[PDB]
Amino acid sequence: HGWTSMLSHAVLLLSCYSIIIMFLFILGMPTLLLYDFGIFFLAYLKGAGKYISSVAEMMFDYTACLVFYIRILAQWIRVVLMVVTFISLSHYVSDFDITNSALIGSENQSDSMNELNTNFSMTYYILTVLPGKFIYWIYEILHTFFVVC
């Protein structure tokens, strides 16, 4: 979506419309398929009835048509999982540590440069604590790649 950055005030405008288009036209696919079946559409789903009671079969046909739509609609929970996993990775990267101790000739003198800053974490920071933050970073992205794929 990079090529649409200046086309509107929202970079993800086309993506936010496309997910709605994707939802509506996928939802209409089973509906148009039942229309193509005709009035016999319930026999295409469940098959032959079992009881002489039309009211009894009416309940079983109401379930087969519901199951027919749940097979499609319940798959959008996979899209929810992919979005949540992608947001948690963006939250970890956006909040990742970056201070003046990593800058070359910093001029941000008021951002903790001239203050006493001790911590209560494990010492040997770049050997113990900093690699641990990177280990969890690798887990976040490897877990994301496995989920979204």
Partner: protein, 61 residues
């Protein structure tokens, strides 16, 4: 005096397709007639203020 006049909020349209919650929710909203009460400042839309409950997602910079 200038700062005080500047805080009196301006009127910002409610219609919004840039925020994906409004893009979906406003398709089910019902536009009701806003009967004129005799004033020129009826806040029938949201207000152009960063602290307004319907404008907090807007970046006022």
């Amino acid at each position: 005096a200038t700062r005080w006049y500047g805080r009196q909020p301006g009127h910002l349209l409610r219609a919004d397709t840039y925020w994906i919650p409004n893009l979906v929710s406003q398709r089910f909203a019902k536009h009701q007639p806003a009967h004129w009460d005799g004033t020129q400042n009826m806040p029938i839309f949201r207000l152009a203020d960063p602290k307004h409950k319907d404008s907090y997602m807007v970046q006022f910079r």
